[PDB]
Paper text:
The envelope glycoprotein (Env) trimer [(gp120/gp41)3] mediates the entry of human immunodeficiency virus (HIV-1), the cause of acquired immunodeficiency syndrome (AIDS), into host cells. Binding to the receptors, CD4 and either CCR5 or CXCR4, triggers conformational changes in Env that ultimately result in the fusion of the viral and target cell membranes. Here we report the cryo-EM structures of two cleaved HIV-1 Env trimers solubilized directly from membranes in A18 amphipol-lipid nanodiscs. We suggest that the MPERs assemble with the gp120 C-termini and the gp41 α9 helices from adjacent protomers to form a membrane-proximal base for the Env PTC.
Residue numbers in the entry:
A (entry chain B): 520 to 669
B (entry chain A): 32 to 146, 150 to 309, 312 to 321, 321A, 322 to 395, 395A, 396 to 464, 464A, ...
C (entry chain D): 519 to 685
D (entry chain F): 519 to 662
E (entry chain E), F (entry chain C): 33 to 146, 150 to 309, 312 to 321, 321A, 322 to 395, 395A, 396 to 464, 464A, ...
C-alpha cells in the first residue's frame, strides 16, 4: 500500500480520519519496501554500480535522507514521540487569518499548506525550535533544584 | 479562541519533484539467467501485486512535454544500450575496400529479375586479425544497405559509416528482446497516473490514480508505427505540443491492436571470421533456399478502419470540412522514410507507403467497411530490407553493427500507436490538410507510455493551528 | 565489535538477566565506536575512490545505515523509539503459542523461539503498531485540552510548589 | 537572531540557548535540500554515470547521513535520544577541571571549554553508558 | 555537586579534512555547452550565500597546510583527465612531417611581415579509417609544435611525439573557466578570514563562515594570476618561509590590471579524419596577413603596480632595499615565459618588459601618472602558441588543442604575481631579486584559498550542572 | 494474561549474503610506491580484534555452499582486472617472431644444463612510437611462452597471441600476497567453527564469532597450498562428495613443509619501447652461466606428511584400499606442473617426485627420521619459468609478467594439497589412485574460509510476557 490518499478529503476530514492510521501504514510500508529490497540485495547481490545499479544506489540514499531530515525536524521540534504533537507556539494572524472550521471544513491539507507555505518557513523553522530550547533549558533549571517526590 | 501550532506527521500533502527512478522487472528473467537482454539483468523484482490508490477529489495538472520521467527514461535506455555494446568487438579493422560481387543466388537465372537483385552482396576483403605480420582474404555475405559504392567500380563497395562513425558489433550472445520494464520511484516519491479515459496529454487530468511503479513499459524502439505498446481506451487519441505548429510531431495512439505478422522467411547460416586477438566478427555464411523478401502481414480492412478512426479524430482536431491526405514520409532518414523496427534481433526497414497512402475526403462515406472475401482483404505485405549496421538515432559518430540471426525469424507485434506530422504546404485555397508518418526521437516512443505517469514527492510534515496547547511548562 | 554479544544466547531468562540490558547497550555502543573508527580512517587516508574495495566499503556503509534505520523506524511505528525493551498491550492469541512463560523463557532460546514464530512474526509486528496507534489517537484526544485539570495541577496539586522547607 | 555559529564567541550559557540553530543544519545540506533540480538532472540524474563530482556529491551525502546517525546512536545509547539537553546521573568528578559554574558558563566559551575536557571525553561517554546500565537495572526491579 | 549535561548543538568546530563538492551558478549550465570543468555536474549555487560572522572569535588559518588546496589540485587535474579521456588520441597522426617555411610560397599575404618559420607548413601521408588507403595531408604547426629530425631542413615531427600520447581536446568541450563554489557537506563548514591583510597563516581578527566558497574560476596561468580575487587597499605578500629561497612567493594585488590579448590571425578548420569516428582538426589556412599574438599593458598602471609590490617587499626584507625585478633565468617554457589559455588557445607571452625593471630605494616613491597618453604606450608582449601542452607534473600524458575558427580575443585582469627570491650569495647587498615563479597548480589554489579553512562541526557537547537525572519512573 | 513484549538485541542471526570489505594492517600503506591487491583501499584492521566464543552454541557450516569463497573469487579476479586495466598491452608484439640463437653458445651454458635453449634471442621486425621507422630488437623468451610457427625452424609466436590479448602487467605493481582481513559490515557477523576437525559440512560443536576474518593471503597456487593455514592436532581431508571421483579432494596439512625456491640467475632487465609511453619489459642478458630454477623439499618430512594424509585416506575409503599417490593425469601446464608465483615471477615445477609413492598400508611402517641431515634431504623440483599466464576462467585476457632483475628467491609454507580420485579398476584392485589437481581458484579461498560463515544479526524480536504497556493506564 504505502498511499495516504484522502488528499482531496477536507484537511479536517484528513485531520480526523487517516490522521494516524494511514500515516502509521505509510511508515509501515517504507520499512517493508526497504526490507523487500534488502531481501533481494542478499539474493541477487548485483549491487554492482551498473546503469540500474547506480539508480538503485541513488534511490537508496534519497530515501534514507528523506526519512532522516523529517525525523530530525520532529526531534528538534520535540515531536519525535509520535505523528501528532501539540506545541506552545500561538498562530500569528499573519500566518493564517481564518477560523479552525474554515481551515478544517473549507480547506484541503494540500491547499492549507499552499497558503501557509510562505509563513511556514518560520512557524516551525525558528519559533517551534526556539520554544523547545526554552522548555529544554527550563527543564534543566527546574531539575537544578527539585524536591517534589509523589 | 486560542489556537497553537500542532505538527502532524503523515499529512496527505505532496509536491511536483524529479528523482532517480529504479527498474523493477519480473524475477523470472533473473531465474532464467539468460542475462542477454540489454537491461533487466540487475533490475530488482516487481511487487507481485501492484500497489495503487484512487486519489478521489484530486485534480492534479498533468503535462506530457514536461514529464521528467520521459527525459530520464531516454538517457536510461540510451545508457543501457551503450553499456551493452561497450565490451563488444568493433568493425574498425573491417574498414577496407569490399569486392561486393553479386551473390551467386542474385546471379541465379532462376530468379530472373524477380526481386532482391544485389540486396544480398557477396563482398570479399583483405583483413588483419591478431597476426599483425600476415594479412587474410575473407568473404562476408553482406547486405546492399550496409555497403556503399566507392570507386563507381562494378563490385567496389564499403561498409556504410566506415569513417564517419565507429561501427561496434553488438555481442551475438546478447538478446534484443524488450521485456516489461517497471520504473519505480524511491520512497517518498510517487508516480501519478492520469486515469482519464481521454487526455489531451497536457492540461488538468480529472480521473486520476497513482502507482509506485510504472506499468511494464517495454523499451520497444520503433519508427512511425508503435508496436507492442499501451492501447488507447475506446477513442484513438492524437497528442501534440502545438497542433497548429508543423515542426512538432503528432502522436496518434490507436484504441485497437493491429496485430502485425513480421517474419524473415530465409533459412540462414551464421559465419564468424576472427578479426583481432580474441575478437571474432560474425557475418552470414549461406542463404539456404530461394531468397525471399522479408514482409509483414496487415489486414487491409482492419487497418482501413483504423485510419478511418484516426482521420475522424484528426478532422475534429483540425477542420471537419478539410481534405485529409495520408501522404508518405517526404524523404529523411531511412528509419523515417520507411517503418523501422527490430524483430528477432534483426532490424527490418519495411516499406510503409501502402499503409499510409489512401487520402480520406470530408463529407463522404465514413461507413466503417468490412471484408467480404479472404482474398479481398488478403494482407498488406511490405518490401523490407534488413540493415544490420544501425547508427545512433540522434548521434552520427556512433554506429552499431548487428550480428546476423541465423535461421528463420518471426514476430507477432501489435500496432498500438502511430507518429504523424502535419504539413500544410500552402494548401491551394486551404480545404486540404496533409499528414505524413513521423518518427525518430526515442522520447516520442517513451511519451506514448508515460503519457499518464507524473512523478511527485511526498511531505508527511504539516503544521496547523489547534485549540490544544503543549502546556508542558506548567 | 570487542564484546559483541559477549555472553552467548542462553535460556531467554538467563539471557534476559542484566546481560541483555548491558550487552545490548554495549553492542550498540561498540557498534557506534567501530563505525567512528572507520570515519577516523576515511578522514585521513581519503583514498576510497570507486575501487573494488572502495565500492565495497561505500555499499557496506549504506547497508549498515539502512539496516539501522529499518530497526529504528519499526520502534517508531509502535511508539518504542526510546526504551530498548518496551511492553505492548497486544495479548498473546493462544494461536501464537500454547507454551507457558517458563517454557518460553527457562527453556526456549531466542534463536529457536523466533523459528516457531516465523509465520506469526509479520502478523504480530502489525498488531503491535496497530494497537499503539489505536490508543495513541484516543490518548491524543483524551488529554487534548484538560486545561482545567492543569490549572488544579498547579493550583491544588501545585506541580511546581515553592513551599520547600522543614517541619 | 544569532547566525549558524553566531554564539561561537558567546559564553557557554548564552550559546546554550542557541544550540538548536546548529542542530538544525547538522543534516540539512544544499545538495540534499535541492531535491528536484531546475537542471534536466533528477536528484543528481544518474550521478552523471559516476562523474568525478558525481561521486563526491554522493560520498558527501553518506557522510552527512552516517555522521548524524552516529551522533543520534550516541544520545540513543545514553537514552536521551529525542531530547537535546539531557541530565546524566554521572557526578562531575572535579579531576576533570576544578572550576566554578560562574566561570564555566559566564566566561569560558564552548570552543574553549571543550579543549579543557578534550582528554576526558571517552571516559565520560562510557561512564554515561554504564550509568544507563545501572538505571536499567533499577527500572527492571521497579517493574518486577 | 554537579552532573554531566549532554548539550546537543554546541557551537564547537575542529579542523578536519573531508571531501568537498562544486556548486557552479545555474547560468553556467544554462549555457548548454559542456565545460572542461564539468560545471553541469556541480549542484545549483544557492542564490544568496550565508556569511555568518563569528563575533568574539579568533581562528588560526594555515594557507600552506590547507587540505583543500591538495584536494582541489587533484579535482582540477582529474576533471581534465575525464574531459579528454574519450577524445581522438592523435596516436597514428605522428609519422614523418615534411615542412615548408610558410603557408605562403612567397609574399602571397605578408611573408616579409609574417614571422617566417612559425607556420612551418608540414605535409604528411596519414591513413584514414580505410586501412588500405593512405592520403597525403598538410597542416600548420607553430615552431613550438614541431621538432627538426634527420637533420633534414624540411623533415620535422610533433614536439611531444615519441614520448607520450597527445590526445586532441574534444572540440565541443570549451575551456572558459566558470566560477565554482566548493561547498562543505552538512556537519562541516568553511571559515573565512574577514581580516583585511592576512599573511595566510596565524590567528584571524575577524572570522566568518560559509557553507560554500565564493566563486573561484579554475584559471591556470604562470608568472601571473588572471581573473583572481583582489586584496583590500594593500597588496599582500605571503610565503611559508620568506627567509627561504626555493619557497615560491605568492602576491595578491589590491588593484586589477587589464590585459588585452588576441590572436590577430583569421584561421579555418580542416577535419583530417585519422581513424573511424576519429577526426583530427587542424588549421586549413590563415585568411589575410599573419600577425603574431600580443598583449596590451598600461606601462603607468604596471609601473604603479610594481611600485606597490616593491615597497611591500622592502617592508618584508628591511626598509632600506633596492628591490630589482628580473626575468626567469631558465627551465620549462611553462615557468620561463608567462603562459596562459585564451579562448581555447594557449599563449606563451615574453613578459620580458614586465620584469626588465631594476629599482633602487630613492626617488622611486613618486607615482608618475599618464600625463602624455602616447596611445597609452601600451606594453606589447611578444606572444606565441604551443598547441601541444605537456601535463605540468606528469612526464607522459601530453594533449593537443584543436584550432579555433577565426581571430581569438581575450581581456583578463592581472590579479596576482608568483615570485622566487634568489639567494643573496653576492651582489645582493640591497638588490633583493624576485624572479617570476609558477609551475604548480597548488600555488594558484593557495592564492585563492588562503582565507578558507574547513572544520568538522561536532554537535555533541558535555557540561557540569547542579541538575540530576531524577528519573525514578 | 500474556502481552507480547518487544526486545531489542535478541541474540539471533540468519544465514545471509553481504558485501564484505577488505581490511589490511595498513603497515605497508605508508609505502605507497608498493601496490599489492589495492592495499591502500583496505581499511586498517581493528588494533585489538576480539573473538567472542559462542558458549553452548552449535551451527552447520556448508563450506561448498559458503558465499565468502564466491565473493573472494569475484573480488580477486576484479583486483587483477583493475591492475591490468591501466597497464600496457602486447597486441603489437604478436608479430611473427624469428626465434634463433637459443643460447649464445651450447658450451658451458648447455654442456650439462637442462636449459637446452629454453630462452631464445628471438628477433622481430616490429614498429615503435616513431611509427614510420621500424627496428628489429632481440629479447630472451621462455620456450614455455613461445609456440613454433610454420615448418620454419625459427618462425615462432606467443602461446596465446593469436587467440588471446596479452596485457603487459605494470612493473611498479608488486605481486606479493598480503594478509587481507575480509571484514563483515555492522548488522552482520562471521561464525567460526572451532572444532579440531571438520568434514567441511554438518553441525559444529565448538563455534565462535568474529567481526572480521583472520588474515587470509590471496595466494593462487596449484597441486599445493602455500603460506596457508594449518590443521588442528591432525591432517583434515575435505570434499563435497569424497566417494565421488570428480569432486576435487581438498587436504589441510597439520605441519608446515618449508619449500625453498629460487631462480639462481643474475638477470639483466632490458626494456623495449613499443608505442608512445609503451615500453615492453624483457631480459637483455643472463649475467653468468644459466642455471635452472629448483625447489627444496625435506625428503624425510615429505615422506612423513604423505604417510599422514595416506592414513587419513585409508580412514576415508577403508584400510583394505592401498594409497597410490600417482603423478598429475594431464591437461593444462598450470595444473600438470605445481605452478606458483615467487618474487613476482611464476614458476612451473615438475611434481612427479612428490607424487610417486605407493604407501600400501598392508606394508608395515611407522615414521621416517633424518639421521643423514646433511644432504639427501632436498627433493630438488625441476622448476621451469613462464611469463605469459593464461587466464584460468576464460580463453582470452592473457597476462605477461615483466622479467624481474637478479635472483628471485622465496620460502613458502606448504599447508595442504588439492587431489583427484580416479574411479576405475584400480579401486577394485585394492588401490586408491590420488593425483594432484588445481586450476580452480575457488578451492584456494575455500582452504582459508573453511572455518567461516557470514550471518545477519536481526536485533528485532517478540516474546509473550505478563507485563502490559501501562502508558494506556493513565489517571486524572
Ligand atoms: C477503405 O475506406 C474507404 C473509405 O470508406 C472505402 O472506399 C470508399 O467507398 C465508398 C463507396 O462504398 C466511396 O463513396 C463513393 O464516392 C464516390 C465519389 O466520392 C466523391 O463524390 C461523392 C458525391 O459528390 C458529388 O457531388 C459533389 C457536389 O455535391 C461534387 O462536388 C462531387 O465532385 C461529386 O460529383 C461524395 O459523396 C464523396 O464524399 C466524394 O466527394 C461516389 O460516386 C459514390 O456515390 C455512389 O456512386 C458510386 C458509383 O458512381 C457507387 O460506387 C457508390 O456505391 C454510390 O452508390 C450510391 O447508390 C447506391 C444505390 O442507390 C447506394 O446503395 C449507395 O449507398 C450510394 O448512395 C460514393 O459516395 C468512397 O469514396 C470510397 N473512399 C475511398 C477513399 O476510396 C474502401 O472500400 C475501404 N477499403 C476497405 C478494404 O475497407
Ligand atoms: C483575513 O485577513 C485579510 C487581510 O486583512 C482580510 O482581507 C481583507 O478584507 C478587508 C475588508 O473587506 C478588505 O478591505 C481587504 O482588501 C482585504 N485584504 C486582503 C489582503 O485580502 C480577510 O477578510 C481576513 N479574513 C477574515 C474572515 O478574518
Ligand atoms: C559495371 O557494370 C555495368 C553493367 O555491365 C557497366 O555498364 C555498361 O557499360 C558498358 C560500357 O560502357 C556499356 O556498353 C553498357 O551498355 C553498360 N550497361 C549498363 C546496364 O549500363 C559499367 O560500365 C560497369 N562499370 C562500372 C562503372 O562500375
Ligand atoms: C575392507 O575389505 C575387506 C575385504 O577382505 C574387509 O574384510 C574389511 O573389513 C574392509 N574394511 C576394512 C576396515 O579394511
Amino acid at each position: 500500500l504505502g498511499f495516504l490518499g484522502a488528499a482531496g478529503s477536507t484537511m479536517g476530514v484528513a485531520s480526523m480520519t487517516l490522521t494516524v492510521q494511514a500515516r502509521q501504514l505509510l511508515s509501515g510500508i517504507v520499512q517493508q519496501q526497504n526490507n523487500l529490497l534488502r531481501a533481494i540485495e542478499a539474493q541477487q547481490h548485483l549491487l554492482k554500480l551498473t546503469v540500474w545499479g547506480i539508480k538503485q544506489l541513488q534511490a537508496r540514499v534519497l530515501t534514507v535522507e528523506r526519512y532522516l531530515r523529517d525525523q530530525q525536524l520532529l526531534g528538534i521540534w520535540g515531536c519525535s514521540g509520535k505523528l501528532i504533537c501539540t506545541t506552545a507556539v500561538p498562530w500569528n494572524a499573519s500566518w493564517s487569518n481564518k477560523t479552525l472550521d474554515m481551515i478544517w471544513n473549507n480547506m484541503t491539507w494540500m491547499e492549507w499548506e499552499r497558503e501557509i507555505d510562505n509563513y511556514t518557513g518560520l512557524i516551525y523553522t525558528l519559533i517551534e525550535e526556539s520554544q523547545n530550547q526554552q522548555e529544554k533549558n527550563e527543564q534543566e533549571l527546574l531539575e537544578l533544584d527539585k524536591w517534589a517526590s509523589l
